[PDB]
Amino acid sequence: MNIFEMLRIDEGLRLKIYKDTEGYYTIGIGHLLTKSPSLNAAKSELDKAIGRNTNGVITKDEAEKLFNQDVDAAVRGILRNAKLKPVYDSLDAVRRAALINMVFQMGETGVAGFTNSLRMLQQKRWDEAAVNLAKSRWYNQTPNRAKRVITTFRTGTWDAYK
Numbered sequence: 517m518n519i520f521e522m523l524r525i526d527e528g529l530r531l532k533i534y535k536d537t538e539g540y541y542t543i544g545i546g547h548l549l550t551k552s553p554s555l556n557a558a559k560s561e562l563d564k565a566i567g568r569n570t571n572g573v574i575t576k577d578e579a580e581k582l583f584n585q586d587v588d589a590a591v592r593g594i595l596r597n598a599k600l601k602p603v604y605d606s607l608d609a610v611r612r613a614a615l616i617n618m619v620f621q622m623g624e625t626g627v628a629g630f631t632n633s634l635r636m637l638q639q640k641r642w643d644e645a646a647v648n649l650a651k652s653r654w655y656n657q658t659p660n661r662a663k664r665v666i667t668t669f670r671t672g673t674w675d676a677y678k
Contacts, residue, residue: 531543544578544583547565
């Protein structure tokens with residue numbers, strides 16, 4: 517298990533434009549296209565992303581390509597963020613993966629606001645952190661996924677993804 521496999525489990529793989537858990541047009545392995553209500557808007561973003569006229573459909577390779585870019589972007593986000601970086605740097609690899617997952621899901625900004633949770637993480641107060649992390653819209657809207665990531669922060673193992 518690794519961050520790619522982990523996210524691939526959480527996000528799935530769909531080759532046609534689909535809607536998010538939030539109702540937003542997405543494709544591939546959780547590649548958000550646009551928050552816009554317009555399907556055409558989404559198709560436009562898709563074509564720009566891929567570099568061809570896709571008409572809403574992509575290949576597996578293309579999905580993985582966007583995925584790889586997305587993963588990279590999440591890390592890059594973390595590294596650049598003054599609240600995130602110090603936490604990330606303090607964590608072991610497995611736990612780093614959990615943080616990347618969250619950022620992949622809710623964005624750098626969203627995650628950087630979990631001030632109390634981030635602090636507990638830095639303090640390596642695993643159980644406490646896990647408790648704090650669940651007190652969120654994140655957890656209530658995507659409880660099974662949140663439970664997995666939280667478990668991962670709690671234990672520093674991949675048991676939730678086994």
